[PDB]
Design a binder for these strands. Sequence first.
RNA 1: UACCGACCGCAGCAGGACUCCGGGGUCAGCAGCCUCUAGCGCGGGAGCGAACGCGGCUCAGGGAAGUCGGCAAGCCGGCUCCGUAACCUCGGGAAAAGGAGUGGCUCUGACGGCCGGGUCAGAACUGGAACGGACGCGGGGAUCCCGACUGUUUACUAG
RNA 2: GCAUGAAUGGACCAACGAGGAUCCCACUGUCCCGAGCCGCGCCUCCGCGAGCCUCCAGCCUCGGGAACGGGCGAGGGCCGG
RNA 3: CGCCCGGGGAGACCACCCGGCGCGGCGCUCCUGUACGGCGCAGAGCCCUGCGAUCGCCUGAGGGACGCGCCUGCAGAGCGC
Lengths: 378, 64, 96
Amino acid sequence: SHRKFSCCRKGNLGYLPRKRCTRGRGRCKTFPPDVQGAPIHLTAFLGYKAGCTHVMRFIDHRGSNLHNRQAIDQATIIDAPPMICTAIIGYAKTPKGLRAVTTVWAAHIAEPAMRRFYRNYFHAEKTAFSTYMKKAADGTYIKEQLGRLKQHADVIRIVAHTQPALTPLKQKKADIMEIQVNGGASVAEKVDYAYALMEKPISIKDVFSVGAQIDTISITRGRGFEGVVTRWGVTRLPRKTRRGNRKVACIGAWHPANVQYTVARAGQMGYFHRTDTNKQVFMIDTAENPRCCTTEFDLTDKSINPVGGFVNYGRVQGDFIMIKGTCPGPKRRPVVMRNALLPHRNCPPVQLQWISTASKFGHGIFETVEERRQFYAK
Amino acid sequence: MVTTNQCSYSGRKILPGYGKRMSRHDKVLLIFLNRKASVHYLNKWNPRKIRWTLASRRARGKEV
Amino acid sequence: NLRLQKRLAADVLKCGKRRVRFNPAHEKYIEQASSREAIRSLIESKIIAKLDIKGSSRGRIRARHAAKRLGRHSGHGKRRGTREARMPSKTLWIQR
RNA sequence: UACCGACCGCAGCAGGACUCCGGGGUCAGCAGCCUCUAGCGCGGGAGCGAACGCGGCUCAGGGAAGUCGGCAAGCCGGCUCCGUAACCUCGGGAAAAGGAGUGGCUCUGACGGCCGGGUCAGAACUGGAACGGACGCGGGGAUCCCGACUGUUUACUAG
RNA sequence: GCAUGAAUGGACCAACGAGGAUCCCACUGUCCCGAGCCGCGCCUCCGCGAGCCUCCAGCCUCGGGAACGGGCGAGGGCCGG
RNA sequence: CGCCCGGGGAGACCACCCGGCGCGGCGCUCCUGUACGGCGCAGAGCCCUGCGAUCGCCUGAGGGACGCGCCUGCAGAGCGC
Ligand SMILES: [K+]
Ligand SMILES: [K+]
Ligand SMILES: [K+]
Ligand SMILES: [Mg+2]
Ligand SMILES: [Mg+2]
Ligand SMILES: [Mg+2]
Ligand SMILES: [Mg+2]
Ligand SMILES: [Mg+2]
Ligand SMILES: [Mg+2]
Ligand SMILES: [Mg+2]
Ligand SMILES: [Mg+2]
Ligand SMILES: [Mg+2]
Ligand SMILES: [Mg+2]
Ligand SMILES: [Mg+2]
Ligand SMILES: [Mg+2]
Ligand SMILES: [Mg+2]
Ligand SMILES: [Mg+2]
Ligand SMILES: [Mg+2]
Ligand SMILES: [Mg+2]
Ligand SMILES: [Mg+2]
Ligand SMILES: [Mg+2]
Ligand code: NA
Ligand code: NA
Ligand code: NA
Ligand code: NA
């Protein structure tokens, strides 16, 4: 007979199966669409999650109760040391989909990439690219391959890698990513632009801008094996139940004589590949600037690094980006940033007035160590 | 930020977005720095004998 | 396996066998002893001994009782038991 | 006339199985908690610190909206003083209901005997507005039905 | 008054009850709506080491059929452990 | 077209992500709330050349750390395939 009262199912069936991610890191499945004639630009970057904090801003939002006053907002900091371009890959559109044409590697490759090619660098015999680097000493081979790409490709991407030596991480091998080149008037313009920045650093300042929106892709926090109450959010059973009350009472009808895939069961929770969309950029700066986080209402110079350090993360050494809200993952998890595909239309402009830099280790009340020393008669 | 408040119980400085405020029936507004302060006040513990507060340091002469 | 020697030693010294203690450097001498006379000889030479009773100290109790005689620890919070139970009326009347 | 709860339950079985001797502290107490004497480490260990179970603890705001049903848990509780209704077989009801106090230290008085002993009462000072600080230890009230009351009963589903 | 009623006892009743029932105060994870934690088991290892059950076997949908098939007819899937 | 081994941001076992690990210190930060001892015309009082609960000063002190930064110590790249 029919269920007496109305209620929806619990959980989203579009995120199945709930299994540990088998991809090494967060990967960019799709890139923003390419429109001919727009200025040529890059579409993505890779960084590391560092922390969260406060900001006070001024809201100019016509038609809302916030239109002429202040608001306290949550922000997230992502550490973005420069990336090195090192290869060019071209694709051709085909009846079978996107097929690679060829990939051309630079004459000289840095140690982090070489490390990425092995499992144990100290013991491994160093043979990767040993023959290739002799062939490509002169520019002739590179030119021939780029001519091939110019005459046969439809989509152009570059290959860049991170520099973990500029971070507090323990890892020494780098992360290799493909980044698409959008814009221009033809494929030749794209190929020349990509060739103009080979073996060169790329800064996040040249990819994103303040006030635009981005998508973030990462892997969420892990929890191991978990029960239905926490894994799927079903109701607990009453106290008098024999054999406990954290479970689903009925897991099916008599017919069909099987268990359906739509019924909640226990298993792995967390460590999933996820993507949050439409996050607004608040600030792009570098930790090498002493007035990094000083505004019109402040006096003493304050930088990004808080008093006592970023908890469970080293100190930030260089460039970084600030976004509004939250992103998946814990601290130190690699994060891929990407231009938004379907941005939100009505976003008020960003107008920072004050940034909180107190100690997040405990409850701190001093924005700088000099103020603390003054206070404690030190 | 220039505009900061003072804790009602301990006399310390509070930064934007960092505590809670209570309104009493007598129409008086109390501002607290953390949960430790609000528990001290709610239990009616005299701040003049809690040695880390400003009220206590003034009575001792350490603070002028 | 010195089980026999402990029993005889406790019999001779007239104590519990939890109080008999051996000297762990002359274990073979003790091992050779099997009669009460050998035990008596070994006790003579100090190879076998007993410990004093571990009496419980009464220093705190005496100080508390002196203070109580002075008048302390006698308020209403320390006193659980009715006043008739703490001092019967029949006894008072009989003495009077 | 040794020795044993080594006895009975198919067993070296968390069951059953009569009696004697009975220290110290806290206390009304042979209660609960710690302990001298005496006895003794019992169907084996290591790692890890998921779900879930068994036995426990805490929880913002609300306070029975949960459920056949306040089931379960929680509240109360020692002692001293104050104050206690309707009804009644005049004996009760009654700890009715409901209030306040309680630590430590330094003192004062009262009660015997031709030196001892504890108890009861009062005061100053002083501790995060704290004191039956563990333990032990009633939740209460207004009504209807049945049986007067203490007692007995289906060993193993009905008290 | 389907079909009450007088020692097959009628009516009433203070005190009493691990008796059946309704309501009020206080109290609270009973609940809104769940969260965190402690010990033991579980789990991995060394040692030791059973019972129950068992035509044969062990993926589905429809048909017909002792009228609700694992095997039969027609289709759809599936390395093995 | 390698593992064993160690550590986690990963975890029932496995796997996954990373590796010249880590132990032990020093500094920063922040949790508690002002250490023991000494010294006081402090101290209600007293059987008073002494006893006394408490209080003040040295003392936002002492104790602690699973976060951050360094190394002045000790150490850390070895068997099956
Ligand atoms: K329905
Ligand atoms: K005999
Ligand atoms: K009864
Ligand atoms: Mg049951
Ligand atoms: Mg924190
Ligand atoms: Mg005999
Ligand atoms: Mg028999
Ligand atoms: Mg037995
Ligand atoms: Mg209800
Ligand atoms: Mg209901
Ligand atoms: Mg109950
Ligand atoms: Mg009866
Ligand atoms: Mg009875
Ligand atoms: Mg029975
Ligand atoms: Mg029964
Ligand atoms: Mg009749
Ligand atoms: Mg008649
Ligand atoms: Mg009749
Ligand atoms: Mg069958
Ligand atoms: Mg067939
Ligand atoms: Mg973890
Ligand atoms: Na009498
Ligand atoms: Na007892
Ligand atoms: Na079927
Ligand atoms: Na002191």
